[PDB]
Amino acid sequence: SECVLGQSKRVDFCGKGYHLMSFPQSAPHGVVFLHVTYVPAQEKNFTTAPAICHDGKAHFPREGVFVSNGTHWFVTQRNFYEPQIITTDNTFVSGNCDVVIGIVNNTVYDPLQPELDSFKEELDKYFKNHTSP
């Protein structure tokens, strides 16, 4: 009722790992299940900080964990390495960055930054196109 007709959230019930799906097979005086499970492959370690402070305010990942490879930071999925650039779309702000311990310093670029660097510079180009005469 659970492994075959749905996907199960019970750990270590429909297989060793994160369950995906299953297949029944008949047998004399019994049944046989074929559990298909997802197992993480090789891993690499990184350096992590619980929050990031840019404008004097802490930032937390909306979904994901902050990681770094030494130079600059990233936010990735929990169970698969896929770094992304820190952006206000990825984070939410909650209070100032002095009460929290372990916070570190970096820069957050808002998603409107390309919406401004391609527009404000364009508008500044427009402004310089009209102020000169």
Ligand X SMILES: *[C@@H]1O[C@H](CO)[C@@H](O[C@@H]2O[C@H](CO)[C@@H](O[C@@H]3O[C@H](CO)[C@@H](O)[C@H](O)[C@@H]3O)[C@H](O)[C@H]2NC(C)=O)[C@H](O)[C@H]1NC(C)=O
Q: Which of 69, 121, 123, 125 binds a copy of itself (CB under 8 A)?
A: 123
Choose between 98 and 110: whose C-beta lies nearer to a copy of itself.
110
Q: How far is the CB of 74 from another protein (least distance, A)?
A: 10
21 touches which of another protein, ligand X, a copy of itself, none (CB within 5 to 8 A by kind)? none
For residue 34, CA distances in Å to 24, 59, 68, 81, 94 come to 7, 44, 39, 29, 46
Q: Is residue 105 close enough to count as binding ligand X by CB under 6 A?
A: yes
CB burial class (10 A; 0-12, 13-18, 19+) of residue 52?
Answer: buried
Do 44 and 74 form a contact (C-beta atoms < 8 A)? no
Tokens of 20: 């995906």
Choose between 50 and 88: whose C-beta lies nearer to another protein.
50
Tokens of 101: 């311990």
112 touches which of ligand X, another protein, a copy of itself, none (CB within 5 to 8 A by kind)? a copy of itself
